[PDB]
Structure 1
Amino acid sequence: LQSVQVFGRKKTATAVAHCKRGNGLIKVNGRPLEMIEPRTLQYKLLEPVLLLGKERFAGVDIRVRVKGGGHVAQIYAIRQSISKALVAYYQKYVDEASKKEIKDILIQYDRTLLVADPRRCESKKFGGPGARARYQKSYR
Structure 2
Amino acid sequence: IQTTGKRKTAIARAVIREGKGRVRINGKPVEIIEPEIARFTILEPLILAGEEIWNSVDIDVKVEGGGFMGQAEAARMAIARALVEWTGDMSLKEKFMKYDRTMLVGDPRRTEPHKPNRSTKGPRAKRQ
Work out which of the residue numbers 66, 78, 100 in structure 2 matches 1:110.
Answer: 100
What is the root-mean-square deviation in Å for CA atoms of aligned residues?
1.4
Structure 1, 52-61 or 25-34: larger mean CA deviation: 52-61
Work out which of the residue numbers 67, 71, 78 in structure 1 matches 2:75.
Answer: 78
- Equivalent pairs: percent with the same residue? 43
Deviation at 1:23? 2.1
Distance in 1 separating the partners of 2:19 and 2:37: 29
Structure 1, 56-65 or 103-112: larger mean CA deviation: 56-65
- What are the equivalent positions in structure 2 for 1:1-16 lying under 5 Å apart? 4-16=1-13
Q: Which runs of 5+ in 1 are unaligned?
A: 92-98
Distance in 2 separating the partners of 1:56 and 1:25: 11
SS at match of 1:35: coil
For normalisation by structure 2, the TM-score amounts to: 0.90
Distance in 2 separating the partners of 1:86 and 1:114: 11
Task: State which structure, 1 or 2, has the greater radius of gyration over its C-alpha atoms.
Answer: 1
Runs of 4+ more than 4 Å apart:
none
Distance in 2 separating the partners of 1:17 and 1:81: 6
Distance in 2 separating the partners of 1:63 and 1:56: 15
For normalisation by structure 1, the TM-score amounts to: 0.83
Work out which of the residue numbers 99, 112, 120 in structure 1 matches 2:110.
Answer: 120
Work out which of the residue numbers 38, 44, 49 in structure 2 matches 1:47.
Answer: 44
Q: Which runs of 5+ in 2 are unaligned?
A: none
Letter in structure 2 aligned against 1:125: K
Letter in structure 2 aligned against 1:11: K
Distance in 2 separating the partners of 1:74 and 1:50: 19
Distance in 2 separating the partners of 1:21 and 1:11: 30
